[PDB]
Amino acid sequence: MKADILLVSHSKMITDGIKEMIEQMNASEEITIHSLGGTSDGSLGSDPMKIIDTINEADSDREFLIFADLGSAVLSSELAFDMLEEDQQKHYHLVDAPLVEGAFASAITAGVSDDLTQILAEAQNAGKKGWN
């Protein structure tokens, strides 16, 4: 199956770091990761048009998984959805999961599974460490 992970944040440093970390761990051999942090010029902030353009510039045969950390990243991920065509919304998935851990979980299970329900469930389960 065809999957992309879209990483939204105020910080381009965070999303580049996630992408680089996952790729170097060899965890994204079966998934495309887009670093979408920052405004149009690298500034701290979020632009929904990065998501829109990314979806518009990609092939139509992808499932698009959207992770955000906080704030306007979250808002930008929600506002982008409402901007898409109907065909595109059916392929757009807001993943209720933490940014780093959700994405890594989505990525590592796509190298294991053809099943978007399971790819989505793993991420949604991700943030904890067995800690206190």
Contact residues for a second copy, defined by CB under 8 A: 9-14, 16-18, 20-21, 24-25, 37, 44, 68-70, 74, 93-102, 104, 126-132
Measured CA to CA in angstroms, residue 73 lies from 26, 64, 110 at distances of 26, 16, 24
Return the sign of the alpha-carbon dihedral for residues 93, 94, 98, 99: positive
Compute the least distance from the CB of residue 53 to a second copy, in Å.
21
Q: 10: part of which helix (H) or strand (E)?
A: none
Compute the least distance from the CB of residue 44 to a second copy, in Å.
5
Compute the least distance from the CB of residue 14 to a second copy, in Å.
4
> Catalytic residues, which ones?
10
Q: Nearer to a second copy by C-beta: 10 or 32?
A: 10
Residue with tokens 């670093």: 35
Q: Nearer to a second copy by C-beta: 24 or 59?
A: 24
CB neighbour list of residue 71: distance below 8 Å, 6 or more residues apart: 10, 46
Q: Nearer to a second copy by C-beta: 11 or 28?
A: 11
10 neighbors 70 (Cβ within 8 angstroms): yes
